Write an enzyme that holds these catalytic residues in place. Structure first.
Site: not given
Ligand code: HEM
Ligand SMILES: [Mn+2]
Length: 291
Positions: A45, A49, A172, A188
């Protein structure tokens, strides 16, 4: 505004593989599926970001400058939780002071994806740290409480098409939302530090209910205990996204390949690679090296 990749002086594949391995070894050391904090998840992530601030229009943001090291970006609400990834990487940067921040942050996500059994992601060095005043303002990262049109429009700014968007979102499958970070809660899928196409399968095969979480935010919840952000669920509301969701759910390899290209592209947006830059590096995982 042009950012030319500049190879860290004298460095080559072996050096970065070493950085890979240090990160990979610490992930093995620091991550356990059951843990609240997923360092590997934080790393991909974080790589997203640091890149997702990018604006194709003027080449502001993007991974090149490594500006996440700076307070304004470090404290982006959108980056809540990522500090764990930063802290994870600090001993690694200390061991390898010569790599730039951008390269390290981006390499972290590559390393994390590969070590969690995702696809190989070719990775290019050459990001150069830029000064604090080049830090992009907050707000360039996407909102989760939105629909398919938002998503499609959002990623246009990152020069991503429908396929690229849908592939990228499949990350995700890793991890989960943490209510205190984002206002969402729940996995997820199999939040087990394993990179798979489970995101797509869950979208299509779970029984989703639009509910409100303890933060008063709507998310899609399944009987299995999984959740989807509205933006995730967007991918099956929109008929164009939906066809690609289904393709990825039915083809793990295809998903891996497409994710691989899109992630690298994501991590490389904003960066100019001279014609004579090294070829992309494909790092070996610990297990491939017998480490
Ligand atoms: C419209 C697109 C996106 C939004 C709205 C979204 C939003 C979020 C949200 C709200 C979280 C949780 C953060 C927290 O609570 O710990 C999350 C985590 C994460 N995001 Fe996304 N995300 C998007 C796209 C992406 C993309 C493009 C990737 C990477 C290729 C990605 C990778 C991840 C990772 C790896 C997590 C899991 C983190 C955890 O388990 O700690 N995200 N995302
Ligand atoms: Mn985490």
């Amino acid at each position: 505004l042009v950012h030319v990749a500049s190879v860290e002086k004298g460095r080559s594949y072996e050096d970065f593989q070493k950085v890979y391995n240090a990160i990979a070894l610490k992930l093995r050391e620091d991550d356990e599926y059951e843990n609240y904090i997923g360092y590997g998840d934080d790393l991909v992530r974080l790589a997203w970001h640091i890149s997702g601030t990018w604006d194709k229009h003027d080449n502001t943001g993007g991974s090149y400058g490594g500006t996440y090291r700076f307070k304004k970006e470090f404290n982006d609400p959108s980056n809540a939780g990522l500090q764990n990834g930063f802290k994870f990487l600090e001993p690694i940067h200390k061991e390898f002071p010569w790599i730039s921040s951008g390269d390290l942050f981006s390499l972290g996500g590559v390393t994390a994806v590969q070590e969690m059994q995702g696809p190989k992601i070719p990775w290019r060095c050459g990001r150069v740290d830029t000064p604090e005043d080049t830090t992009p303002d907050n707000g360039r990262l996407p909102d989760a409480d939105k629909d398919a049109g938002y998503v499609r429009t959002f990623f246009q700014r990152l020069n991503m098409n429908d396929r690229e968007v849908v592939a990228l979102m499949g990350a995700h499958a890793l991890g989960k939302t943490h209510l205190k970070n984002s206002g969402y809660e729940g996995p997820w899928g199999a939040a087990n530090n394993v990179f798979t196409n489970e995101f797509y399968l869950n979208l299509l095969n779970e029984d989703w209910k639009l509910e409100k979480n303890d933060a008063n935010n709507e998310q899609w919840d399944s009987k299995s205990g999984y959740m989807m952000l509205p933006t995730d669920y967007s991918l099956i509301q929109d008929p164009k996204y939906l066809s690609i969701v289904k393709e990825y759910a039915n083809d793990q390899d295809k998903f891996f390949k497409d994710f691989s290209k899109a992630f690298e592209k994501l991590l490389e947006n904003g960066i100019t690679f001279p014609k004579d830059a090294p070829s992309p590096f494909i790092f070996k995982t610990l297990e491939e090296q017998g480490l």
